[PDB]
């Protein structure tokens with residue numbers, strides 16, 4: 001069973017791996033047949049290869065990632081609020097999404113969706 | 126056509142309605158075949174009648190509801206972090222869930238899922 005402690009630990013590990021640029025660390029949290037929809041509304045990317053490619057590309061820039069509130073976890077799901085800060089096109093940018101994870105029996109993330117829109121993307125020029 | 130601005134406005138109306146105990150106002154935001162899963166993992170309430178009953182029971186005891194961060198809205202979906210505060214017989218409780226709304230083309234909410242676990246239910250004060 002997915003304990004709240006496990007799902008919370010996985011969310012923390014995810015954020016830590018992103019903040020450190022640990023690609024293998026991020027991918028290791030996902031099932032081999034998992035799906036990533038980032039952002040919500042974009043083409044779903046499934047399978048280890050597609051997931052690795054997505055994060056590999058995201059990590060081409062140093063990302064400062066931090067949780068901004070307590071993790072919500074119940075049943076086999078977790079949701080969390082956080083910020084991702086980086087410099088893009090010579091402008092300080094802070095994105096504030098809410099991510100949602102679904103876990104399987106092995107405690108692996110089988111589906112992740114990052115919900116953020118244009119109004120959650122803050123570029124300070 | 127359902128847009129990000131519309132969904133965000135609906136989340137604001139939803140929170141204001143919860144604070145006013147406006148059952149009709151809350152229900153008016155949902156589609157006829159909408160569903161409510163509170164909390165995530167429990168049997169979903171389906172249809173106007175069931176949804177109304179859910180909110181009637183959920184608001185018997187007055188709730189102070191507040192968005193704690195910006196609303197996230199994109200492609201027919203929205204997610205928001207907030208708190209629900211109430212007191213009963215001297216016992217204060219603050220619940221911090223993350224809600225996920227899915228909207229249909231007509232701009233009505235077809236799905237509401239409230240993700241929170243016991244770790245998100247804070248007693249004491």
Ligand SMILES: C[C@]12CC[C@H]3[C@@H](CC[C@H]4CC(=O)CC[C@@H]43)[C@@H]1CCC2=O
Nearest residue numbers: 057058063084088093095097116121
């Ligand atoms: C700034 C940006 C949106 C915010 C996106 C960024 C690409 C990397 C991802 C990585 C994240 O983890 C949070 C959101 C951020 C886009 C590049 C083009 C664009 O518009």
Ligand SMILES: C[C@]12CC[C@H]3[C@@H](CC[C@H]4CC(=O)CC[C@@H]43)[C@@H]1CCC2=O
Nearest residue numbers: 143163183209220222224239241246
């Ligand atoms: C049942 C409950 C009040 C109703 C709250 C619920 C937490 C999730 C939120 C989600 C909503 O969008 C509607 C109101 C509902 C509380 C858990 C503890 C409690 O008393």
